[PDB]
Amino acid sequence: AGLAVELKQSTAQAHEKAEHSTFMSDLLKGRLGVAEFTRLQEQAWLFYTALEQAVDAVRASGFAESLLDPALNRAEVLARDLDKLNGSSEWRSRITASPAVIDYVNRLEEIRDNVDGPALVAHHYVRYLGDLSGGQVIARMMQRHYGVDPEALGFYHFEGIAKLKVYKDEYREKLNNLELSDEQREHLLKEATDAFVFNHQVFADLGKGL
Ligand code: COH
Numbered sequence: 001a002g003l004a005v006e007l008k009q010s011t012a013q014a015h016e017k018a019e020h021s022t023f024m025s026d027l028l029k030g031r032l033g034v035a036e037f038t039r040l041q042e043q044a045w046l047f048y049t050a051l052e053q054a055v056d057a058v059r060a061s062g063f064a065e066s067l068l069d070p071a072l073n074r075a076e077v078l079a080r081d082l083d084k085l086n087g088s089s090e091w092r093s094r095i096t097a098s099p100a101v102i103d104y105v106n107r108l109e110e111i112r113d114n115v116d117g118p119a120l121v122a123h124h125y126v127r128y129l130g131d132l133s134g135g136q137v138i139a140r141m142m143q144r145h146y147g148v149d150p151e152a153l154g155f156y157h158f159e160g161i162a163k164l165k166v167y168k169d170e171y172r173e174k175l176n177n178l179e180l181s182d183e184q185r186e187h188l189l190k191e192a193t194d195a196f197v198f199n200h201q202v203f204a205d206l207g208k209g210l
Pocket residue numbers: 004007008015018019024028125126127129130131133134135137138196199200
């Protein structure tokens with residue numbers, strides 16, 4: 001099978017475990033509220049910011065340039081979401097990374113400084129293709145359960161993408177057409193597993209004290 005299929009197969013168990021996260025299932029089923037949704041997006045702003053510096057570096061190196069579409073950038077869209085959710089830009093100087101996000105960001109800075117192309121693509125697949133594939137569902141649940149205004153949900157919609165099912169097919173075809181050595185390929189597949197572990201840990205830190 002091509003890269004896109006084995007990525008899906010090798011992370012399918014982690015995706016199902018993520019859906020059963022105590023924090024995330026509580027958020028999605030309506031048992032939390034807007035404040036907790038805002039906490040999650042603050043942590044996301046931190047690791048999307050680090051992710052996009054690593055993407056900038058790997059793109060500048062020439063690796064997987066076509067896959068690393070800048071239209072996918074989420075950090076400034078999240079910042080505008082958060083100015084609306086919090087009522088001011090005051091959160092920017094205030095939020096601190098949870099331990100999970102500290103480690104996640106550390107790894108993304110390691111990938112940026114090593115210009116580790118294969119590892120970055122793994123993180124790119126896990127965040128952005130997950131966003132593209134399920135973001136509309138999550139945003140709808142925040143509307144339905146908590147009345148979150150759509151203009152605070154821009155993170156879940158990609159403005160510069162017209163046909164969504166077509167874009168996702170092309171993304172997977174670019175994954176399939178990536179040229180990789182056997183070792184690079186094992187490095188990428190392992191990193192995809194790690195990227196799900198990191199995201200699961202972020203959920204665990206957010207669930208603390210609840
Ligand atoms: C309840 C909504 C929900 C949650 C909590 C969720 C939790 C997470 C999560 C948490 C840490 C991460 C990193 C991801 C990342 C992904 N998700 Co979702 N996803 C979600 C809704 C979806 C939907 C919808 C799809 C499309 C297929 C499916 O599972 O129905 C999806 C598929 C994916 C894919 C694509 C697999 C492939 O096509 O190769 C990635 C990557 N994901 N997802």
